Ligand binder design. Structure first.
Ligand SMILES: Cc1cc2nc3c(=O)[nH]c(=O)nc-3n(C[C@H](O)[C@H](O)[C@H](O)COP(=O)(O)OP(=O)(O)OC[C@H]3O[C@@H](n4cnc5c(N)ncnc54)[C@H](O)[C@@H]3O)c2cc1C
Ligand SMILES: Cc1cc2nc3c(=O)[nH]c(=O)nc-3n(C[C@H](O)[C@H](O)[C@H](O)COP(=O)(O)OP(=O)(O)OC[C@H]3O[C@@H](n4cnc5c(N)ncnc54)[C@H](O)[C@@H]3O)c2cc1C
Ligand SMILES: NC(=O)C1=CN([C@@H]2O[C@H](COP(=O)(O)OP(=O)(O)OC[C@H]3O[C@@H](n4cnc5c(N)ncnc54)[C@H](OP(=O)(O)O)[C@@H]3O)[C@@H](O)[C@H]2O)C=CC1
Ligand SMILES: NC(=O)C1=CN([C@@H]2O[C@H](COP(=O)(O)OP(=O)(O)OC[C@H]3O[C@@H](n4cnc5c(N)ncnc54)[C@H](OP(=O)(O)O)[C@@H]3O)[C@@H](O)[C@H]2O)C=CC1
Lengths: 394, 394
């Protein structure tokens, strides 16, 4: 097989890059290890930044999101029994966030690709990358029982945190930055209506809790739990009971509990690799970084990497400016680190850390008190929650 | 589940460590991602060092190897039309090498374990490691559809180069050393008798070639090829024809060619991570290092790591000397680097490298000429080929 851009990964990153490239006229092939059903079988809500939403429009895959998505003009933080609203819309000009699951976004993208006939190979096992230093890079993989090879100009590794593209760059050439938090997020999806029309992040002595929603018809809730907790020791009622205890009574009082459609425990962590490229290979999304969910930034960073990479790819092909791709890492990395910072900040002011002393407890309470009570402070959060502006290339 | 030593990997490393531990009386559990058939389905010959052979005896799994293995007292190197024999037996005291496939060794080990009833979980998917810093480490994995947890004292990562145990140590705490050679080994297994009763390593202007044997009834041959070569462009006769061209006519003349039972291209590479442990996790075999096959050292290093780790584990449990495990890495690493050196040396004097000048060509020819023509020289190779002695712990 021969193509211009090889794309490892049919997740939101791969699909989005692939579609954008498709419409620009740049030939591309996506290699996915799993099956269409498997990929689409992973459930996950999503809070999308305006940038992410604009990028999907441009990709021509915004039809359904426009009909089913929920545009939130604000977000809430609760602590010390009170609820404080951060007017995202006003405090940032007019940017907003749109609630539309990742599963749905992925689904929407697979339909757009399946339709236009762009190339996608599923069940592409044992993917391996070659000649990243030369100018004739290629990929090998086994499908339906035979050995295949795919030649290209550049490979975009969008295979996520456990992918192989990052694992294909000489370790020495990369610097890894990471933090593993001492807790995870126990989540419960339900078809019960949301306790609020905007998300609610709650700080509480017993621990962090989150009131969100995957769609208009399903609620998404989270409570922080030690890393050694087993999801099977958390029956629905035990969850619902802990959730209420971490919320202001006014909220826990009007909350509609129900049987959990899905439950699980997701560990929190920060991960950043520098640089995010090697020769003809460029990393995007989870393949290059991980951010704790507290900032609602995983899918969104993935989108900005894609945007930057797409846009630089145009320049390169559509203008023979193949050098501008050297600036890929430095550009994304600047937005990635700012995203890591805001998510690290959100995590620190919202969660209960172990062995924390009286002073730390007071500083945390004061962080929330000052930021939520100041216009400058409320603005730092707003502009970050909606997502910082994408940096122009040239 | 609860056990003393958790073992990730049911390959030669895992199985060997597991059996040895079993006989010592230390409780152990092996978690394997694949199925028994799959593991056993990977075919691979093997040249075992005396140390490896002694370790299998001690493990009580030497019955079949003793009946089917071939003990070679010497090995040959060909170059410039001549054949030079390195009397391994004499030049090293009495140590020898035994030819018995890895597949067979693995098979022999699975039967010994299956029989004694020791614990082994196959199809243990999504393995993940936890609490490596504390003293109550544990492992999580999904089987038959449910989520399981395994507690232990120490985890031994024997999951190979693509395993997850190495990928579970904070990247920053590890230093990686590696070299990727500009060529691979195209191999052809046949049921035709071997052209020689001892292996034949051949240096030749056209490139390296190897005459070996998996068993008494099957031949194993290899020719070096550029990394971009596709196995499908190498029909049996094209292989046989190239093989003969790299051998002294006296050998190629009495060679019995036949249809290839198995063919493939294996890339060569050197890989070493320092240290080879993190808290309660210890790496063994391919999970910590890779050596080019030219030295016949992959399986053998794996065995010496296992020996060292087993022996230190005894001390720890059987004597409360749990500190001696801190010396695991430094001990193995000293033998690993010497093995990397000998394999790197063998590779350099036997293969054709690209863009090599007249001087390099002459030095290589002279390396072979001097070492094979000197008793001191023949000894450096002999003592290394059979395998250097295992370093005592205390
Ligand atoms: C509780 C929680 C909530 C989250 N909520 C949000 C949210 O509200 N908003 C937000 O912005 N982010 C959110 N995220 C993050 C988001 O889920 C990820 O950042 C996103 O999935 C990354 O997409 P990706 O395409 O980069 O990788 P993935 O979605 O992981 O996709 C990678 C794809 O490539 C495949 N692949 C892997 N290995 C290979 C291989 N060897 N060969 C070929 N293909 C391979 C994979 O199987 C997969 O299909 C959340 C995370 C958590 C833990
Ligand atoms: C051409 C060639 C010839 C060779 N010939 C020889 C020779 O003659 N002599 C010699 O000494 N060496 C030889 N070797 C090397 C030898 O094959 C390896 O070094 C050996 O297989 C390593 O064994 P291991 O148990 O460490 O790993 P492996 O055999 O790779 O086993 C690891 C096991 O763990 C499993 N695992 C992986 N991931 C997970 C996970 N996530 N969870 C659970 N389990 C997991 C794997 O599926 C596998 O079963 C050769 C190599 C090459 C390329
Ligand atoms: N995902 C991850 O965690 C990591 C990915 N990588 C990257 O992946 C590649 C790893 O290199 P590598 O695994 O060697 O390449 P491959 O995975 O492609 O090698 C597989 C080929 O090696 C053969 N082989 C391996 N062992 C033996 C043996 N004992 N006897 C005979 N044949 C054997 C295979 O046989 P068969 O098919 O029979 O098994 C097969 O022909 C590199 O690209 C590296 O940069 C590196 C580290 C980690
Ligand atoms: N092999 C390798 O290459 C590597 C291994 N590692 C190591 O592996 C672990 C990696 O950490 P991590 O992957 O997070 O742990 P896990 O692989 O165990 O995390 C899986 C859990 O995270 C959930 N999850 C992930 N994304 C989402 C999402 N968007 N929405 C809802 N739930 C989600 C999973 O859901 P579901 O089941 O639905 O997917 C599931 O509950 C660490 O031990 C690390 O040190 C690190 C790097 C590489």
């Amino acid at each position: 097989m021969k193509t211009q851009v090889a794309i490892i990964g049919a997740g939101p990153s791969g699909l989005l890059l692939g579609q954008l490239l498709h419409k620009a006229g740049i030939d591309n092939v996506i290699l996915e290890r799993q099956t269409p059903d498997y990929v689409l079988g992973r459930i996950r809500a999503g809070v999308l930044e305006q940038g992410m939403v604009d990028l999907l429009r441009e990709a021509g895959v915004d039809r359904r999101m426009a009909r089913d998505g929920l545009v939130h003009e604000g977000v809430e933080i609760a602590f010390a029994g009170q609820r404080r609203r951060i007017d995202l819309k006003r405090l940032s000009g007019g940017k907003t966030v749109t609630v539309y699951g990742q599963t749905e976004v992925t689904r929407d993208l697979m339909e757009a690709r399946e339709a236009c006939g762009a190339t996608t190979v599923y069940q592409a096992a044992e993917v391996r990358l070659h000649d990243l230093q030369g100018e004739r890079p290629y990929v090998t993989f086994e499908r339906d029982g035979e050995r295949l090879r795919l030649d290209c100009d550049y490979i975009a590794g969008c295979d996520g945190f456990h992918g192989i593209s990052r694992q294909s760059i000489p370790a020495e050439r990369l610097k890894v930055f990471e933090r593993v938090y001492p807790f995870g997020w126990l989540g419960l999806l339900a078809d019960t209506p949301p306790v609020s029309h905007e998300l609610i992040y709650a700080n509480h002595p017993r621990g962090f809790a989150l009131c969100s929603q995957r769609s208009a018809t399903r609620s998404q809730y989270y409570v922080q739990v030690p890393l050694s907790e087993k999801v099977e020791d958390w029956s629905d009622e035990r969850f619902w009971t802990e959730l209420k205890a971490r919320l202001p009574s006014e909220v826990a009082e009007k909350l509609v509990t129900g049987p959990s459609l899905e439950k699980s425990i997701a560990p929190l962590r920060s991960f950043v690799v520098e640089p995010m490229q090697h020769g003809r290979l460029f990393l995007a999304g989870d393949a290059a970084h991980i951010v704790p969910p507290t900032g609602a930034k995983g899918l969104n960073l993935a989108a900005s990497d894609v945007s930057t990479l797409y846009r630089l790819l145009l320049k390169a092909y559509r203008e023979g400016r193949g050098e501008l791709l050297e600036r890929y890492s430095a550009i994304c990395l600047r937005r990635i680190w700012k995203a890591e910072r805001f998510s690290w900040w959100m995590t620190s002011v919202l969660h209960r850390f172990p062995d924390t002393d009286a002073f730390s407890q007071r500083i945390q309470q004061t962080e929330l008190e000052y930021y939520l009570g100041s216009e400058a402070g409320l603005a730092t959060i707003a502009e970050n929650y909606v997502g910082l502006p994408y940096e122009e290339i040239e």
